[PDB]
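2024-03-11 09:14:02 INFO queue: dequeued item Fatty acid-binding protein, adipocyte, len=134
2024-03-11 09:14:02 INFO validating residues
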Amino acid sequence: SHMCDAFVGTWKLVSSENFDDYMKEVGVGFATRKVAGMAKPNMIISVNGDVITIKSESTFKNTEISFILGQEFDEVTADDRKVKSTITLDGGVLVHVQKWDGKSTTIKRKREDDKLVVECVMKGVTSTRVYERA
Ligand SMILES: Cc1nc2ccc(Cl)cc2c(-c2ccccc2)c1C(=O)O
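2024-03-11 09:14:37 INFO prediction written
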């Protein structure tokens, strides 16, 4: 079906802006913010039929989620939140909403030129993380 063809691949983080404030807003403690903020993850995105898998490999944590668009799932985040996640495709953007403890954060993943841009939003705080092909 070629859904998400442009996202598929191996991507390496090259820049991050305002991620400390994002993590604070989400509730991440001091030490975890410091160590997570250093990391330069490899994000590996693959598709097999209707199932999308996004793996993140880094010095901090390795994470993996597999999901079907529109179908809620359980996720344990890198900072150990136990969240309920739903990922949809809206106008070519992967939109990932995480719900936990009456809170919500949204992570958007977009293809821009040869980059994959990740925008993380919690209340009024945004962080932008830019990935290039690995
Ligand atoms: C989207 C996201 N949200 C987070 C929230 C809190 C903390 Cl501490 C970490 C993350 C991370 C992350 C950062 C560094 C290495 C590995 C994961 C990511 C991610 O880039 O995949």
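2024-03-11 09:14:37 INFO annotate: The longest strand covers residues 103-112.
2024-03-11 09:14:38 INFO item closed
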